[PDB]
Amino acid sequence: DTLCIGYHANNSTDTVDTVLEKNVTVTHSVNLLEDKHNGKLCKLRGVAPLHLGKCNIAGWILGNPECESLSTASSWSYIVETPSSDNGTCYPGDFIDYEELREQLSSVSSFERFEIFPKTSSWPNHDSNKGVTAACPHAGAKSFYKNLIWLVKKGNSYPKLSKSYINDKGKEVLVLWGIHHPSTSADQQSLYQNADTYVFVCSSRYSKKFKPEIAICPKVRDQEGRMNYYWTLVEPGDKITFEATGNLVVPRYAFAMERNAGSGIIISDTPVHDCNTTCQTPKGAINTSLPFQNIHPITIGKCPKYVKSTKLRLATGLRNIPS
């Protein structure tokens, strides 16, 4: 009569590495490395992202005719641009603190577009129609940003304008405006009459004075002139005052918003899908059950640490010796 003591053995072909020797076949093992995704841009923590499609943040936040602007509604966990989002500033110029605006719009809850300065009743002393250009075409015809209005002289006079807005909303209000720079003195007078002008914008915290800068610059989108875009956040109980004698692209639409901690912007072709994840990647969403991940180094959310490893499987069973 015999009684033997032994251990398990199976058809398992799983291999692991130990500090002592490599490629050891064991009975059972588990992968510590998450190396798969869903190739989709999912909703982060329940909240979907804001896909700008063929537009970039600039073109979207401004009224670029090609941009849909959406709008219904309201909040998002992050923003998505496509590698071919070329529709932004249809009129050449500088966009001051642009990266900051994008960063601060990465994740906003409660986002409400409103007509801070109603078009029909705001500017009775200035022309709010001639302010169009071929640089921002819409359906063949000349057009302009939907959120800004390009004021010009009414007839033969540009009266000093002074408009003001008090934040009646219960949140921060993002305000955007532009300063135009004609290419020639001829265009200045033909545009604003005054020749020597100034623009002034200030609140309780913000305060800047703008002077037109006239010169012929290299043609961009067939425009020799330039147009700079500025922006600020007006606190809940604060007042912002605009003042100008010309060269001002007054605001028409502003934005009420409650900015979150701050996420990021993914620039990818990866399609947006109806899925839920706690970790997002430009290539797609991954699970957060494993502590490590080699899908992509640039993630958004509570993600597994990024490593260069190709495999990280932990031996659970014992050395497989079927023999």
Binding site: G6, N10, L32, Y78, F292, K305, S309, A315, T316
Partner: protein, 170 residues
């Protein structure tokens, strides 16, 4: 290797035993076959599952948007940003690799240890009522039937019961 049992004085594994990590192969008057030891197998399953869960769960992760956009006049802090991501990358990659290496070795030592202790355990029950024949096998000096094997496995082997019979056949 570290304990001499697995790939040691017990050269191979049992494809036959398919219900547990460690167990026995009996062969007596009324047949033979394989049968896993439930106490030590379940105990190990609970401890290796805990090990795995520890390396996984202990990983606390803060909500982070790794991505950052810097313009053409912000190269210095862009590269600074690059140094942070790479720094973390090299830290986590090196640590993750050494962890799997190190803990895999222990896991194997842990199984080897369990097989060792199991062998030692049965040896204590049998004393000299059986003979060590190598390869992690015992040969009973008495008639050990099914109910006998069953008592050896569950540690409740009645030594003084078969003590007499065994001393005889020598």
């Amino acid at each position: 290797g570290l304990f001499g049992a697995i790939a040691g004085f017990i050269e191979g594994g049992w494809t036959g035993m398919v219900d547990g990590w460690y167990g026995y192969h009996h062969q007596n008057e009324q047949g033979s076959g394989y049968a896993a030891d439930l106490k030590s197998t379940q105990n190990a399953i609970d401890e290796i599952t805990n090990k795995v869960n520890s390396v996984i769960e202990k990983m606390n992760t803060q909500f982070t948007a790794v991505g950052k956009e810097f313009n053409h006049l912000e190269k210095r802090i862009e590269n600074l940003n690059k140094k942070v991501d790479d720094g973390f990358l090299d830290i986590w990659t090196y640590n993750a690799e050494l962890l799997v290496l190190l803990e895999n070795e222990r896991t194997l030592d842990y199984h080897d240890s369990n097989v060792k202790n199991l062998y030692e355990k049965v040896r204590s029950q049998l004393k000299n009522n059986a003979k060590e024949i190598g390869n992690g096998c015992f040969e009973f000096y008495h008639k050990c039937d099914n109910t006998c094997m069953e008592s050896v496995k569950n540690g409740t082997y009645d030594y003084p019961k078969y003590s007499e019979e065994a001393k005889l056949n020598r």
